[PDB]
């Protein structure tokens, strides 16, 4: 389709730390499903 080189960003480390913290926040929302 296209190249992964072209769809890149200006800051690697900020992506790394914000993405790790956002993954932690997103897995904080997970639960065991039951019925209301």
């Amino acid at each position: 389709g296209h190249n992964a080189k072209a769809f890149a960003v200006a800051a690697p480390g900020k992506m790394a730390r914000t993405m790790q913290r956002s993954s932690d926040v997103n897995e904080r929302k997970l639960h065991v499903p039951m019925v209301d």
Binding site: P12, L30, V32
Partner: protein, 121 residues
């Protein structure tokens, strides 16, 4: 002598050559594309929430992850605390069987092993 040019007015060639060549390094590519955390078992996270699916060898349990849905094995330290997880428990796991049980039902396993807290049911 060496492969690289060494002119006074040849900084452009060196900079362009370095820019071209850094893409062949694995760390550079996986840190610019943001896909370096898919090789980790957790994904981008450091802990993963899971469902206690079965009690397994004797110390470990079989726990299904809630995010992706695949089932792994979990290490429960202080083998007596094996009986704190019962069935379908909501656990929070960290890497160590490459996994281990850290936080069961919101509270930590060290607060239950030392009888600091009690499990909310």
């Amino acid at each position: 002598g060496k492969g690289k040019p060494r002119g006074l007015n040849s900084a452009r060639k060196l900079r362009v050559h370095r820019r071209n060549n850094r893409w062949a390094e694995n760390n550079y590519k996986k840190r610019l594309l943001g896909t370096a955390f898919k090789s980790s078992p957790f994904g981008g996270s450091s802990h993963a929430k899971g469902i206690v699916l079965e009690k397994l060898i004797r110390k470990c349990v079989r726990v299904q992850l809630i995010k992706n849905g695949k089932k792994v094995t979990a290490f429960v330290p202080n083998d007596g605390c094996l009986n704190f997880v019962d069935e379908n428990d909501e656990v929070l796991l960290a890497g160590f069987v490459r996994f281990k049980v850290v936080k069961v039902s919101g509270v930590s396993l060290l607060a239950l092993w030392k009888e600091k807290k009690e499990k909310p049911r």
